């Protein structure tokens, strides 16, 4: 505000003082720059939601119109549009609409400086008239949206056309999913059914009955034809908006859901056939879990479009599609006939075509051979050759030496390195695997997870878990992708973006239905592995972690009164020590404070986002403490959507807020940074409930995502389902209660002793 106010004084004084200016700078030039600077200062002030400063600017701009008309300037339209924006941002919807309509009626938007296209004005009126319900959605399309597309004059590229096409597609989409229109179609459908049943009873009575029946049919044809036109315009404009600009890129997720719902309706497939080849494939690159799950060999038109799109994605962005094709052709999910012929065979045909073309031919074989040795190394468990906790050189097994040789002959980027999508299609700047460190660690389990290290070409170390056995990493990979998408939504609001509220991601890469390649997050330490030694180092007279766990597990088959009494007796001899994490890794006070502040913000963000998505299984081994930045990282995100309160001893807390987590906050225990960041996160989440619905809808058309926790993992954890889950998520984002009251309720039930006392003992709540 300080810089922008001083810049306003500067530009006005310079426009007033004629003797200070240079020779060839007339007063029209100084005025025009001044106006442009004011317009620039109004966009910035609108983002910050500073109402009084947009009001000041738009008033001071409107006062410059008389002086500007005498200098020979035509700046009425842009200045009146700035006034209309100030009105609309203060709540005057009708006054803003009337003002924009006046600009459009009597003004010459062509012959005037500070240009103003007529199609962005028309679409602006159309949007504001739809929000205010000022006209029926059949006149909005006839007066404002179709004239806009006609003013584009055949231009189908740029941000102007991008705005117009997204405007029109969102409009038509909104007209399809209309509760009134769906009720009317249902009413006409029941009418048709009942009248046909009545005609079936009787077979001038029949004559009039069948005349009424025919008129019902004509009405129903009219309604369905209206809905079909809306569908064509919706899909076509979504595709044209993706091909024009990059402002609207979650239109790829919405087009994809809309197209997989109408896979049979041949009119959608014709429109998609016509317009699909103009979208850059970098828009669909992150949707390969949903695209490769619908692959089938059926010879329809939907499949001839879907296979060609998947093929082009894997050719343009191979490190984003190749592993999905390999997994699809090397993961025999079952020998039984449960459609996977079509999925498993079609992926095999794409793989065969990939190893035939010139762009990707030094890349597919590399990924082929390397994945084969990674999977072989994963599956190889020997209790003698691999002892849990040791550090074995990977040259003594035959698997290890075949792995080393194969990886030396075939250079690829590290499989667990997160590669950003390249608009120019250049993946040469990506570090390849140079060599492997000679040894590999081993963790405790049955099928020993082995931690490899890879030294890349740029000289960095990429550690990896090579996880084998009887787990499902596709659950964890899908949920990691959903959490990353929602955290990307948080960047669009001023309060969460000012605080960098978001989550830390990692990379899960499923190779087969029994193995995968997890990224070992660089310089973290599990929360339980810090807290259990620290509790005995700082309080040598307290109980140990194992004595608390056993004491809590013994009273697991008793009445809630005895469980709560045992829990109070434990935690009276167990004091939190999480505050020492910030005093021994960061002894400098101005680093200590920034690290402690980052921990609170990263904890608050994942607490609210993990409540909205039902995230469970938040014990100490799934939470990592990054001791370079202080932030927390949540891994193992597969038990979501409330699958955790179905377990034998349910997890009935919204998130993890035990006494340690809270102790690592400070001396204002949960008030202050934690409570304010919970409220900013939850406030920005329930203003993006449409986008979160889109993301979960894309999840609904994923054949392979399981919405219940299979007893295999349910026994590994404690020693329509889509419609219910998405409905619960949708009612956690309801604006009925305020954010302050919602957060107060969550923090009450997350720290309650009667809730923490009846949790599973492996969920270390005493800690
Ligand atoms: N991506 C990762 N980055 C860093 N550390 C990880 C990562 N994945 C797992 N770990 C840690 O490495 C170990 C992996 O163990 P897991 O098999 O996930 O669970 P566990 O603690 O070994 O036993 P359970 O089944 O979780 S009770 C734990 O100490 C985790 O904290
Ligand atoms: Mg784990």
- DSSP for 708-734 reads S--HHHHHHH---HHHHHHHHHHHHT-
How far is the C-alpha of 544 from the C-alpha of 731, rounded, in Å?
Answer: 42
Q: Dihedral through CA 633, CA 636, CA 637, CA 642, nearest 10?
A: -120
Q: How far is the CA of 746 from the centre of ligand 1 (A)?
A: 28
How far is the C-alpha of 57 from the C-alpha of 37, rounded, in Å?
Answer: 10
**Ligand 1 atom nearest residue 519's Cα:** 1
> Do residues 450 and 403 make contact, with C-beta atoms less than 8 angstroms apart?
no
DSSP at 204: -
**Is the CB–ligand 1 distance for residue 441 below 6 Å?**
no
DSSP at 655: S
HEC states along 529-569? HHHHHHHHHHCCCCCCHHHHHHHHHHCCCCCHHHHHHHHHH
**Which pair of structure tokens corresponds to residue 25?**
């700078």
In whole angstroms, how far apart are CA 119 and each of 149, 271, 502, 560?
7, 24, 37, 67
Best substitution site from 521, 621, 636 to test ligand 1's pocket, by max atoms within 8 Å of Cβ?
621
**Is the CB–ligand 1 distance for residue 416 below 6 Å?**
no
How far is the C-alpha of 342 from the C-alpha of 351, rounded, in Å?
Answer: 14
Q: How many residues does the structure list for the chain?
A: 767
How far is the C-alpha of 578 from the C-alpha of 217, rounded, in Å?
Answer: 71
For residue 636, say whether it is annotated as part of any ligand binding site: yes
Q: How far is the CA of 512 from the centre of ligand 2 (A)?
A: 18
Q: What is the DSSP string of 670-683?
A: STTHHHHHHHHHHH
Q: How far is the CA of 412 from the centre of ligand 1 (A)?
A: 26
Maximum distance among all Cα pairs of the chain, rounded to whole angstroms = 98
Q: Identify any residues that bridge with 450 across adjacent strands, giving them in sequence order.
A: 442, 466
> Do residues 500 and 602 make contact, with C-beta atoms less than 8 angstroms apart?
no
How far is the C-alpha of 386 from the C-alpha of 238, rounded, in Å?
Answer: 54
Nearest to 483 by CA among 323, 635, 331, 349: 635
* Cα dihedral 273, 284, 311, 290 sign: negative
How far is the C-alpha of 594 from the C-alpha of 598, rounded, in Å?
Answer: 6
Between CA 378 and CA 387, with CA 382 as vertex, the angle to 5 degrees is: 100
Ligand nearest to the CA of 549: 1
How far is the C-alpha of 38 from the C-alpha of 30, rounded, in Å?
Answer: 12
Q: How far is the CA of 622 from the centre of ligand 2 (A)?
A: 5
**Which pair of structure tokens corresponds to residue 136?**
């029926």
Q: How many CA atoms lie within 13 A of 218 on its CB side?
A: 6
**Which pair of structure tokens corresponds to residue 273?**
């056939």
**Which pair of structure tokens corresponds to residue 676?**
């304010």
Q: Rg of the chain over CA atoms, in angstroms?
A: 31
**Which pair of structure tokens corresponds to residue 475?**
């659950």
DSSP at 761: T
Listed resolution, Å: 3.6
Q: How far is the CA of 621 from the centre of ligand 1 (A)?
A: 6
Between CA 184 and CA 738, with CA 170 as vertex, the angle to 5 degrees is: 85
DSSP at 278: G
> Do residues 689 and 733 make contact, with C-beta atoms less than 8 angstroms apart?
yes
| Closest residue to atom 14 of ligand 1, CA basis | 443
**Is the CB–ligand 1 distance for residue 430 below 6 Å?**
no
**Is the CB–ligand 1 distance for residue 704 below 6 Å?**
no
Best substitution site from 381, 443, 712 to test ligand 1's pocket, by max atoms within 8 Å of Cβ?
443
Q: How far is the CA of 635 from the centre of ligand 1 (A)?
A: 9
How far is the C-alpha of 767 from the C-alpha of 760, rounded, in Å?
Answer: 13
How far is the C-alpha of 235 from the C-alpha of 150, rounded, in Å?
Answer: 18
Q: What is the DSSP string of 213-251?
A: HHHHHHHHHHHHHHHHHHHHHHHHHHHHHHTT-SS--TH
How far is the C-alpha of 589 from the C-alpha of 425, rounded, in Å?
Answer: 45
> Do residues 281 and 246 make contact, with C-beta atoms less than 8 angstroms apart?
no
**Is the CB–ligand 1 distance for residue 526 below 6 Å?**
yes
Alpha helices in 380-419 (DSSP H): 398-409
> Do residues 539 and 731 make contact, with C-beta atoms less than 8 angstroms apart?
no
Task: Tell how strand 632-634 and strand 515-519 pair up.
Answer: unpaired
HEC states along 24-51? CCCHHHHHHHHHHHHHHHHHHHHHCCCH
> Phi and psi of 434, rounded to 5°?
-85, -55
How far is the C-alpha of 403 from the C-alpha of 751, rounded, in Å?
Answer: 49
């Amino acid at each position: 505000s300080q810089i922008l106010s001083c810049r306003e004084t500067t530009l006005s004084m310079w426009s007033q003082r004629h003797n200070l200016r240079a020779a060839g700078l007339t007063s029209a030039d100084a005025r025009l720059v001044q106006i442009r600077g004011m317009l620039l200062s109004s966009d910035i002030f609108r983002f910050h939601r500073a109402r009084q400063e947009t009001l000041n600017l738009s008033t001071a701009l409107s006062d410059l119109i008389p002086s500007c008309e005498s200098l020979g300037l035509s700046v009425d339209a842009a200045i009146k549009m700035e006034a209309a924006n100030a009105l609309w941002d203060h709540g005057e919807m009708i006054s803003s609409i009337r003002m924009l309509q006046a600009i459009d009626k009597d003004s010459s938007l062509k012959k005037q400086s500070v240009p103003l296209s007529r199609s962005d004005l028309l679409s602006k009126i159309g949007y504001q008239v739809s929000v205010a319900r000022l006209e029926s959605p059949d006149a909005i399309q006839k007066k404002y949206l179709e004239p806009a597309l006609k003013e584009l004059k055949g231009k189908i590229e740029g941000r102007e056309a991008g705005q117009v096409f997204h405007q029109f597609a969102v409009f038509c989409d909104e007209q399809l999913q209309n509760p009134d229109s769906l009720e009317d179609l249902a009413r006409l459908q029941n009418l048709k059914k009942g009248k046909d049943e009545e005609v079936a009873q009787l077979k001038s009575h029949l004559a009039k009955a069948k005349q009424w029946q025919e008129l019902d049919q004509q009405e129903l044809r009219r309604v369905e034809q209206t809905r079909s036109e809306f569908l064509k315009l919706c899909i076509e404009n979504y595709l044209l908006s993706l091909a024009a600009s990059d402002e609207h890129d979650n239109d790829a997720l919405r087009f994809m859901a809309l197209w997989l719902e109408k896979s049979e309706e041949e009119v959608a497939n014709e429109v998609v056939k016509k317009w699909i080849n103009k979208v850059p494939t970098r828009k669909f690159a992150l949707l390969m879990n949903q695209l490769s799950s619908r692959l089938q060999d059926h010879n329809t038109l939907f499949q001839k479009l879907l296979i060609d799109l998947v093929y082009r994605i894997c050719v343009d962005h191979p490190y984003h599609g190749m592993y999905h094709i390999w997994t699809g052709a090397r993961t025999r999910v079952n020998k039984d006939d449960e459609v996977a012929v079509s999925r498993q065979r079609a992926t095999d045909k794409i793989a065969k075509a990939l190893s035939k073309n010139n762009k990707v031919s030094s890349i597919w074989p590399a990924i082929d051979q390397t994945s084969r040795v990674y999977h072989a190394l994963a599956m190889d468990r020997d209790p003698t050759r691999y002892k849990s906790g040791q550090k074995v050189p990977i040259k003594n097994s035959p698997v290890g030496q075949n792995f080393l040789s194969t990886m030396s002959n075939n250079p690829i980027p590290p499989p667990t390195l997160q590669i950003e999508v390249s608009a120019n299609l250049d993946y040469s700047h990506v570090p390849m695997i140079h060599k492997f460190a000679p040894e590999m660690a081993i963790a405790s389990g049955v099928s020993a997870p082995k931690i490899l290290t890879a030294i890349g070409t740029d000289g960095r170390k990429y550690k990896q878990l090579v996880k084998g056995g009887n787990d499902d990493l596709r659950q964890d990979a899908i949920m990691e992708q959903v959490f990353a998408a929602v955290s990307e939504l948080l960047k669009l609001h001023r309060e969460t973006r000012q605080r960098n509220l978001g989550i830390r991601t990692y990379k899960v890469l499923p190779l087969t239905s029994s193995s995968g390649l997890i990224e070992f997050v660089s310089n973290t330490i599990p929360l339980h592995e810090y807290l259990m030694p620290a509790h005995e180092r700082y309080y040598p007279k307290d109980l140990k972690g194992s004595q608390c766990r056993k004491e809590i597990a013994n009273a697991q088959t008793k009445n809630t009164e005895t469980r709560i009494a045992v829990y109070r007796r434990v935690t009276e001899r167990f004091h939190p020590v999480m505050r020492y994490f910030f005093m021994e890794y960061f002894p400098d006070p101005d680093e200590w404070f920034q690290k402690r502040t980052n921990y609170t913000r990263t904890t608050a963000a994942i607490s609210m986002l993990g409540h909205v998505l039902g995230l469970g299984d938040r014990h100490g081994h799934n939470i990592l403490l990054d001791h370079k930045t202080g932030e927390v990282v949540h891994i193992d995100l597969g038990v979501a959507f409330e699958m955790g309160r179905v377990l034998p001893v349910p997890e009935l807390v919204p998130f993890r807020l035990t006494r340690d987590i809270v102790d690592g906050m400070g001396i204002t225990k949960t008030e202050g940074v934690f409570r304010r960041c919970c409220e900013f996160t939850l406030d920005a989440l329930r203003e993006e409930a449409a986008s979160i619905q889109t993301i979960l809808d894309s999840l609904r058309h994923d054949t392979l995502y399981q919405w219940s926790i299979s007893p295999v993992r349910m026994a590994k954890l404690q020693n329509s389902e889509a419609d219910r889950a998405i409905e619960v998520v949708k009612k956690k984002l309801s604006k009925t209660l305020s954010v302050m009251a919602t957060v107060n309720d969550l923090i009450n039930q997350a720290t309650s002793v009667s809730n923490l006392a009846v949790l599973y003992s492996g969920w270390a709540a005493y800690a």
